[PDB]
Amino acid sequence: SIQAEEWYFGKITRRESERLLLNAENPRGTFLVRESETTKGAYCLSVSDFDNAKGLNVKHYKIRKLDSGGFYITSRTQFNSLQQLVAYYSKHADGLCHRLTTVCP
Ligand SMILES: *C(=O)c1ccccc1OP(=O)(O)O
Numbered sequence: 250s251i252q253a254e255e256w257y258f259g260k261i262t263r264r265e266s267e268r269l270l271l272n273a274e275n276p277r278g279t280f281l282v283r284e285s286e287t288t289k290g291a292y293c294l295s296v297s298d299f300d301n302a303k304g305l306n307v308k309h310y311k312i313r314k315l316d317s318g319g320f321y322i323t324s325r326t327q328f329n330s331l332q333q334l335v336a337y338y339s340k341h342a343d344g345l346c347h348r349l350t351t352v353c354p
Pocket residue numbers: 263284285286287288291292293294309310311312
């Protein structure tokens with residue numbers, strides 16, 4: 250049940266997700282999952298990042314869900330549940346700005 254996950258923030262806006270993530274205390278990979286503002290049936294993974302070029306900044310990735318029942322950011326790497334997707338990206342950075350580390354405070 251996606252709604253029971255502490256990293257699932259539900260229906261909050263993109264601007265709100267940035268307000269929460271742009272905190273100097275958040276290390277790289279601090280994240281949250283929310284509903285997309287514009288895409289019905291898609292979720293959004295918002296992630297904090299930090300580099301000397303840009304300093305602290307936030308990236309947003311669209312998580313698609315198939316009717317067939319699979320979750321993915323890239324169609325080449327699919328998961329049976331959102332929870333499995335989060336667990337996988339907490340170990341592999343792949344194409345993300347950083348691996349997922351901590352749930353947004
Ligand atoms: C995720 O839903 C998403 C992905 C990438 C950039 C922005 C974004 O958000 P909104 O879909 O809520 O605009």
